[model samples]
Target: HQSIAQHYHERTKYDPETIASKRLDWAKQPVPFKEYKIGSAIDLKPYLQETPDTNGQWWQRLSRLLFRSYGLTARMPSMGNTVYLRAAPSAGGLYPAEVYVVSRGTPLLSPGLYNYQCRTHSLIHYWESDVWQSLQEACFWHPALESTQLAIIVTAVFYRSAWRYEDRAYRRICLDTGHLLGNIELSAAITDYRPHLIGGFIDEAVNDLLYIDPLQEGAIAVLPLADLLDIQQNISPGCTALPSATETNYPQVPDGELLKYFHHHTQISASITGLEDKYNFPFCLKISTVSAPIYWGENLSDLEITMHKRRSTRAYNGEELTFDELKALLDFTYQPQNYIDQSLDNSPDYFDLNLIETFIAVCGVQGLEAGCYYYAPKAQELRQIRFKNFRRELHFLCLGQELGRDAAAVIFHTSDLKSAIAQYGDRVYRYLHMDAGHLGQRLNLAAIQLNLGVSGIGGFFDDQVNEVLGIPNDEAVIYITTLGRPR
Candidate 1:
């Protein structure tokens, strides 16, 4: 079991230097866009339109594109400032996911391929296609293509995340991408589009269509937009030639070559059918569900508002949060979104919305007992793990950061990775991380509304956490968040 687990881990690990060196091969590829030079003193009228309906109600816009654009406008773009939508937040406020629109035609924009540049809050023209045949071809004829007015593809440049997280960055990148996709679904709801996110796609085809290199960067998920009245019936006749791309190889291999090594060791003898057959698990833990009266708190509306106003809390006050406040945080964290398609069918259940157990260290909360507790979101209760001096334990797990020890509570997000991957494949990685991120963002915002502080801790000792939390070897820690009053 350990060997199998290690094998899966190493196969997914990415090396930065090798990836970079491989990318140098296509440095001279033609830039995807035809740059139209604009005068420095140009009028802003033509370029600026009322932020698209896609950017509708500030809170309703679910796509990361919308959340980011809204964030740019609502929060001051300062150093160390992070923003959150209803979805999870990212580390360092650096959202590594990219959203692109492959539309046939629309009222405001011409039918073509366009990548949304979140920084500028505009779509850069990729090309105008009379039909989505090229896109359909690129995606290998995903059934959603027939009705999809546009397909939103989420891609991740591994280096963007790897720069901060190293090889383990792969997990966070996929997780962040899932958060973005969740937001996109919410945005689709407001825009009247039945947004379906598909994770399985031809890697090379998507990279080519998006002009991204799969070796250095790859598509995380694709969202097909439905429900828009404006549809382009015209179909481009033939397959669009994919542009030649480059590859990057890592210079030094990182530890836990488990997954890659396993791939090399184990033989792929035959083809498999269904997710269950491809990724079956040896044992499955029956997670308990909560049926008790869950106290949702007096500030439900306030909690919703805080989600939009959320920004990562960088400073800490070391003050303890009230028991009610902590309860409210936990309640909302467990709140299920009726907005999503709950059916776990053929669809990619990217955001499983399952409550992976939360390990928290109470640093300075006055009313609550001071110690570590495992929050079962399903049960809507914090199970007392052990009463001990956890301040130092937190600090150590958080890479010796005083913030981890000083905060009122450090919320640790853990998941049964093998189970998740078994049920959902690699796509579950995206959803798990996104769910963690969305919850992290919610915690930050909820803290702010309660006049508290919150910070996302990306670094942690995984093995120590597993042992301390009594997590099975099959499970992995996804994210850690610290909360308290801002110092």
Candidate 2:
């Protein structure tokens, strides 16, 4: 039998010509927001920070953070359907992630567990007081809880995405969750509250803490919001720390069952044997400014407002981005604050990140030839492995999504799955994709800041993406984000 990662990859992998009888019924779609009708709700809009100054209010900080992470930023009708653009982009606009807050006694009002209401931007007080230690036990020896006043548990309502994409929604669910994580981190920065990400935790414990139905909704990621004492130290789990939990069952469809099985099996430490040299790469990224950025102005400069304005670009104008704009995007996306003019910390706080790598398929970037270039984070450059325009091929590789064909640029995130699983057992699958989505989320925001159109492609033909984009064939294509001028 193959490892769970390998098993699920093949099972859910998309094929270009692959078609099925599964039809989506628009009438049956689940609403994105959740409610607790009777829970005392606290309004979050009052705490919105006009400038970078955090009001020093507990709810104030928590309120603004969730707004940016999942708040409804813009609402309009896109053609026939209603598109409610949010802080993070989701595949098929089916937002599956829900935000839950488990808080302790703070400088604020009461102690309780609350569920963030995205529609109205408020918190539904669930259970009052008495559960922080339960989290400590769930998180095991993880250090974040020691200093964190409140924890944000990110969970997924599976059937939302599965309703359309079927079993493949697992990939989207993880990548979309990554986008939320990315926004959560940046949002934390704007609010001055330190955000620590926790990927290693007991699944059953978190599901129980949030009182979620594991079948319909399952916990995927945890974040500890606190004031910082140090960088990555606040978030990184000690390397030896491991997580395990008794599993729970929820109502499931066939597609949901696949998601449930893969997540459950891969998340478990099974008796398993887990299983890259790149080609002679081409050109290094020239850091010297070739020209002023195409869209660096005051309107998009503010972090707070930009998060609200960011939306997934549904169509790209097949235009070229100036070298400055492309460079800035790569800098922000590949990360470590130092790559750009105002580098924050060398890197982000994470449990495991090195298992991932970055690559870009340039089809229409100004002052640059079209080809696939690997983003070298440390050198701050793009190393080309193949040189050619891939517009037509990208359209096909992305399962014929027009976003790929017209994109000025397409970003591919790949990682060595065999080696990663070999090291961390199957749990590494979660780390690998979560990290990819995390990075992709940053790309989503950066593209919006530069005033470019942006969106993520989660359902690409997995193997063909590697071949067409020139990333290592064995390096799994974890995620893709398209960037270009808006229509």
Candidate 3:
């Protein structure tokens, strides 16, 4: 009766008495970027530049798509080396996710597999063979891939994050990929494309297709890029997620083997549908989020700039944020329909977002009660569940981080882990965290654009979160994001 997903969650939790701590080895840190010496590089910088010759519109869109999705935004010193910041945020600045583009025989892009080199803003055409059929077969002939000529594949290199987080690195790896997914969704919109997320695919088949070393790296998600500008490529958004079988029986996984063992068990067999929603609160006080969505400017140019300038706020000034600001933040993150007129994807693909629930610990938001409230995205409202200020409790729950006590509100993303696992098997663990992180990233951008400070906390007292927020103990906490005024 022991679920591997539940075991992994409980085993990796951080408690007050025995928090995992180790002195990081500076000499053994892994490099975040991958490099290929023999592949022909197609420089995309020229396409991004405004030229006197008015041609290659598709080239310009493709160039900007990669840049805004995962290109280098800034560089800073780190342990005698430089860490390059990308459009998507990564925990510990460890960008574990790598982007690859698959072309299904096009005039502009030949049939091949190209690695998106974020460091130089270019694509490395490594494998020039047409393997689209294999990709479709791996994905079980997903409808989006049937007509879409191009797709973006995201893979994770374990050691890039494991060097710091060890076995717990799996959580950060999925969450980091979620942030990149958020960027890809928005960046695709800016470039007139829609990304249909495909979460249920044969893991071994994908890793084999990319010719990646399975021991160190694995494909996490596949996004079929639907070209909205072209009539033929404008396809309907079909089923975005599929389920894997639950594993209740498994061998005792050793300390270092948990990540790999759990990952292998989560792989799917081409068929299965996700289950129904798990949470419904009918007794809490619901506050409607009727405020207007934040504007991202013409062609979402402001969104592009926001992604470039976005940074995790380190400290908060303990100032109160207005209720309007909170409403706007929620509206932007949850109410995608409100922003459709602003040229954004109305229904962005998430790996079973319905499985994730949100609870906010309001400490200092003006015009709103200081209590824990459930954010029901479908209802577009906040339902108060606990009636008391939790500023001090939040600070302790967040492992004594000042951002928790000083922030105006702390959003907690939780899920019914048992039910999630039953629906999507152990792999639902990855889906839950990634979906949570994807939502967190949207809140990050919305908060930053509104001139408010925002930061996500992956480490927390897992069980205490439910007790503090008056949420049921069965609701497992997935991720936390703090919002406030920058100090």
Model 2 Cα shift for residue 55 (angstroms): 7.9
Q: Which candidate achieves the best lDDT against the true structure?
A: 3
Q: What TM-score quantifies how close candidate 2 is to the native fold?
A: 0.87
Candidate of highest TM-score: 3
Better of 1 and 3 by TM-score: 3
For candidate 2, the 10 contiguous residues with the lowest summed lDDT are 268-277
Off by over 4 Å in 3: 20-22, 51-55, 270-281
**Which candidate would rank higher by TM-score, 2 or 3?**
3
Runs of candidate 2 with Cα error greater than 4 angstroms are 20-22, 49-56, 78-83, 228-256, 268-301, 339-346
**Against the unseen true structure, what C-alpha lDDT does each candidate score?**
0.53, 0.74, 0.88
Model 1: lDDT equals 0.53
Better of 1 and 2 by TM-score: 2
As for lDDT, the candidate ahead, 1 or 2, is 2
Instruction: Please give, for residues 193-309, the per-residue lDDT of candidate 1 as tens digits.
Output: 556555545555666776666555666566676654345422222221111111122234445342232212222111235211121222422222233222223423343345456
**Candidate 1 TM-score over all chains jointly:** 0.67
Residue clash pairs of candidate 3: none
